[model samples]
Target chain A: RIEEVKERFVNLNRLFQELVGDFQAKSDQLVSVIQDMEKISENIMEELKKSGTNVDQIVERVKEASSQIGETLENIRSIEKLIQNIMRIARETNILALNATIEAARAGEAGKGFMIVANEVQNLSNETNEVTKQIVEKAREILESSQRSLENLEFMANLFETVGKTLQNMVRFMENNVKLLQEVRNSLDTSKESLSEKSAEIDSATKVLEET
Target chain B: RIEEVKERFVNLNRLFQELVGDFQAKSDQLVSVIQDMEKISENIMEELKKSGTNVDQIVERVKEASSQIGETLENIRSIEKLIQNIMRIARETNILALNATIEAARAGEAGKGFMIVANEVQNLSNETNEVTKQIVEKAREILESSQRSLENLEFMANLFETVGKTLQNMVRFMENNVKLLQEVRNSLDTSKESLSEKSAEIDSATKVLEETA
Candidate 1:
């Protein structure tokens, strides 16, 4: 009966040991999983923070660019007004040349040299008017391109916001899972402690029987 | 038989002692890991809080950009008006050239050279008017595009605000998780206290057995 008791004790000890080891391994695995989850969350936080900063910088740059474009557009308006002034002066010069030619014609033979100068004056004004037209066309292109770029900047901001929100959802999911794992580990600990106490009691009783 | 039983007891006692040590070490490891989890959770909460602030700052930046774009759109509208002024000026120049041509025609033979100059002046004015028309058209294009850009900026600001709110929700969820872990740790500690008391009883019992043996 003593031998039988001893056998039972050994089996019980072995069983308990196996159970403890199994629980330890399982708990360890859970800890590792939690560790991995924590790491992922850390990485996500870092990435999200970085992206947020980047988006801020980009928005700043876009705003800066937009303001600069606005200034350029304002300057172009001034230039347009100046061009209009030049065209007005050119028209006035052409009218003045015509008046000079008419006066030269009235002066008869003495007017030949004056008429030649009047013709050259009109030619120069026409050239200035053509150059101003070219400037206006080029300014228009710049304005159109700037507007397109602003639209694209807005699109980029929207895309980045979506990405940032998606990462936040992922972090919440992982945190909840890790919390569940912690609960399981805590329960395993409670079970192991209870089993340890019961095994100790059996061991003590078995010893007393041997002593008697 | 009793000697054999005593030997068995010696063996059993040794095994029990070993088991106790092994179990204690495992429990200690588990406890340490749980403590680590608690610390990690605390870190998570801190990081989450920082990220929430980051999201808020981003939303602020987006809002600023949207407003600035709105201002730019307003400026573009003013530019459109300037372009229209340019077109009107070109047409006025054309009319002035036409009046000069009529005056030159009434001047008769002396007016022939003046008439040629007037025609050239009218041609330049017409060309200016055409170019001004193109500029006004292009200005309208810019105004339309800038209006579209303003709409997009408004949409982006809304999106960024949504992201900030979502991040706020996540932080709240993580804070709750940390609280749950603290509760679990408290429960485990209570269980550990009961186990220790039971272990003490087993130890005292074994000492009595040893005295009798």
Candidate 2:
């Protein structure tokens, strides 16, 4: 009966060792899972940073394009303003030419030569006013369309800027997750060591029992 | 007649007492073995507890068992008185028979048969002494077997105490097991799911980003 029990005890010890062996193995598998967890968090963090960079680049590109386009549009508006001011002079010249033609007609054949000169001057004034009017209108249209396009670009830039900032924040979020995962993983790593220590203690005691 | 019986009874009883003296010493040695066995049982009990077992009752039980067996063997020593009485009767017959040989020797050739008869009576008395001593030796042999049996019980009892230890203490230890195991088990259990909800949150946020992208 005693021999039977001793053999039984030995079997149980072996079984316990085998059981805990498998048990500790789970911790090994746990680390793999945690390892992958950390990997996922890290990957996500990297992706967020990369996405943030892209968005940041997008915002900058949009800002630069808007700025460059804005400067040219500003120049066009300046030309429009100056041309309108000069276009007023063309209107006044047309009025003076009309008065000169009337006086030339009233003075008869002596004024006939002055009438042709005044008529040519009046026609030139008319052409100048029409051309300037058309050019000013076209400039106004370009400036308005350009303003709308720049405003759209500005909206896109603001949006990309916001998205980029958010992505940066998400990167930090993932950073936090990765740190926590590492902590958890380390706890488990050290925690599994407890089993090894305890098993060793049991085996040491078993050696004594066997010998005694 | 009483004088004749008294003289021979004294001689036979003296040998009986001598046999008894040796038997007492041998019995004490048997008891010494029991004490050592008892000591061993105690040490084994203590070690059993150090290795995590409740042994208070077991040690006391073994001590009582040996005490009872010791008392039983002491009572068996009382059989010595009965053996001495039987030797006394044998001595009386041998003494009367030897006196008959003396009478026959004086009667000359006619007393030879009577002398032979007295001689046979003496031989029978000697055989009784030998048998009585053999009885003591056999009892000692029986005691040796008892010692062996006690040893067997030591291991047997120790095995029983360890293997399927009593419910009371094992229950307490199991409760101890329960508490520690629950802690570690829960740690692992909750540990497993921490990744789940966390992964879910991450995936949900990723869903928004994926849509945006």
Candidate 3:
């Protein structure tokens, strides 16, 4: 009964206009959605690329810092070893002075002159012991300072590693989200295209209705 | 330009038919909106009338309940006054029995029967007092229950009043919405009628075009 009432008198032009308006609005909506999806995808891609570049820069910085830290440690170790060697040489000199003083005691009056020389050498030997103590102290200070620097270098490396890992995770997340957005855009695009085809078909159908 | 385009085509019916289709669709859309508004107005009117009827019915129901509660409270109050009177009478009867027992003691064995009768009268008076106490208790309970019912009647009346007010507000809203709908409907109806007229005019013009061709 409803169909019969609706089909009473066909007004073709008005029907066609309404159909076209509805179809056009639907198509426009789909276009807007697709454009928004595309824009979001582009923004995500740009962000991912920027983060990727930052990761690369961090990796390069970390590599350079790693080598610098290694070289600095090696330099400190060599300096400390040299100072230890110098201390050993000073101890050997002190022993020689002690031996010369004992020989002077064994030679009596004729060795009095040698005893005076030995006493002078013993003072020099004391000066050598002071110099060895100074070298050892300086070396310990250098080693302690180097150890702190090593801690800082290790911390910096770890921080750089964390930054690089965070950037990578964000890039992966963005990539997946972008992919989903693209799929939705593609699906809506298909539906919009179908609507457009249906609109054209309706145009023909409306013509036939008017003729009838 | 129209003549030139018409001259270019041997069969212009296809183009005219397409035009007809477009115009018909617009006319129908305009007509349908007007029809929808018309139908909704009728529905709103019916709903408002139904709400009015419901308010009247509920008001009557509340009035009847209030009258019944008032009658019950009056009955309970009357019963309470009666119980108080009976309590006074029982106290007087107890005093009379005590006087009778004292007189019997003065008469000795000759008044023993009279003493037993006086004792029985005292027991009867005690039972009356007890019955009066129970009546007072029952009267209080009845009055209290009636008072509660009166409160329910007040509450129900207020609730019905609120429901009626809500329906009135809803009706006002519906009327407002319908007013706007009516204006739109009127405008569309005018347009639809105008379009039908235009369609007729176009049909005549096309006939003229055919005749001229």
Q: Which candidate number has the best TM-score? A: 1
| lDDT, residue B191, candidate 1 | 45
TM-score of chain A of 2: 0.81
- In candidate 3, what are the lDDT values of residues B53-95, reduced to their tens digit? 6555656655654564455455445434544554565565556
- The candidate, 1 or 3, that scores higher on lDDT is 1
**Per-residue lDDT of A12 in model 2:** 35
Model 1 Cα shift for residue A81 (angstroms): 11
Residue B161 of model 1 has an lDDT of: 64
Q: Which regions of candidate 3 deviate over 4 angstroms? A: A1-20, A26-47, A50-57, A105-113, B1-213
TM-score versus the correct structure, for each prediction: 0.58, 0.46, 0.41
Q: What order do candidates take by TM-score, descending?
A: 1, 2, 3
lDDT at residue B180 of model 1 (Cα atoms)? 53
Q: Is the docking of candidate 2 incorrect, acceptable, medium or high quality?
A: incorrect
lDDT of 2 by residue, A147-196 (tens): 65455544444433433443344344334435444554555566446545
lDDT tens string, model 1, A87-114? Answer: 7867676667767777867776646655
For model 1 the TM-score comes to: 0.58
Candidate 3, DockQ score (0 to 1): 0.00
**Distance from true location, Cα of B46 in model 3, Å:** 58
Superposed by TM-score, candidate 2 places the C-alpha of residue A9 at a distance from the truth, in angstroms, of 4.1
Best of the candidates, lDDT = 1
